[PDB]
Structures are given as C-alpha cells and as structure tokens.
C-alpha cells in the first residue's frame, strides 16, 4: 500500500537504467561501425598509393640497373 509504491518506483528506475544502457551501447556500436567503414576506405586508398609506388620503384630500379 506504501512499501509497494516505493518498490514500483525502484522497478521503474531499473527499467529506465536498462533502457539508457541499451541506447548508449547502440550509439557506441553505430559509431564504431562508422569508424571501421571510414578506416577501411582510407586503408584501401593508402594501399593503392603504396602499390603504385612499389610499381614505380621497381621500374626505376630496373632502369638504374640497365646502366650498370
């Protein structure tokens, strides 16, 4: 009759806490997925630039050797 309303307040506080937890977690996950996507893109570009540079260094070294 009066202890019960306090216990209902505690229950509601628990459900609220759990909801806020779930939200914070979902925002965190979403953010992490965005960061993983961005990093994948960047590393793709960088990997391309590195590959092209390796090709160019190979050609150059071949030329240098041709003059030995």
């Amino acid at each position: 009759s009066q202890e019960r309303i306090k216990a209902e307040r505690k229950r509601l506080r628990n459900r609220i806490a759990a909801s806020k937890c779930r939200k914070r977690k979902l925002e965190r996950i979403s953010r992490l997925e965005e960061k993983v996507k961005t990093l994948k893109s960047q590393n793709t570009e960088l990997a391309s630039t590195a590959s092209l540079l390796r090709e160019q260094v190979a050609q150059l070294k071949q030329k240098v050797l041709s003059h030995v």
């Binding site: 993983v36 960088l46 990997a47 390796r54 240098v64």
Partner: protein, 55 residues
C-alpha cells in the same frame, strides 16, 4: 551510489560485438599507420632513384 553498479553491469552485458568492433578498429588503425610509413619510405626511395638516374 547505485550508478557505478548500473554502469558496470551495462559495460558487461553482450560485450562481444562491441569488443569485436573495437578490436577491428585497432587493427585498422595499425594497418593505416604502417601503410603511411611504407608510403613515406617508398617516396624517399623513389626520389633517390630519380636522383641516381640523372646521369
């Protein structure tokens, strides 16, 4: 008082997906740094070879 317990329980429940994403993020950061360093080295080498060639 109760917030520390609630946040602690919160960080523990179903932390496999968030841990996996965080780990993948770490790996991608490392790979990125390594690629940037490799590009720096490759550019220096390219310049030195272009320097040897003018002869």
């Amino acid at each position: 008082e109760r917030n520390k317990l609630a946040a602690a329980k919160c960080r523990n429940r179903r932390r496999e997906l968030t841990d996996r994403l965080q780990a993948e993020t770490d790996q991608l950061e490392e790979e990125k740094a390594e690629l940037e360093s490799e590009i720096a080295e490759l550019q220096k080498e390219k310049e030195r070879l272009e320097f040897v060639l003018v002869a």
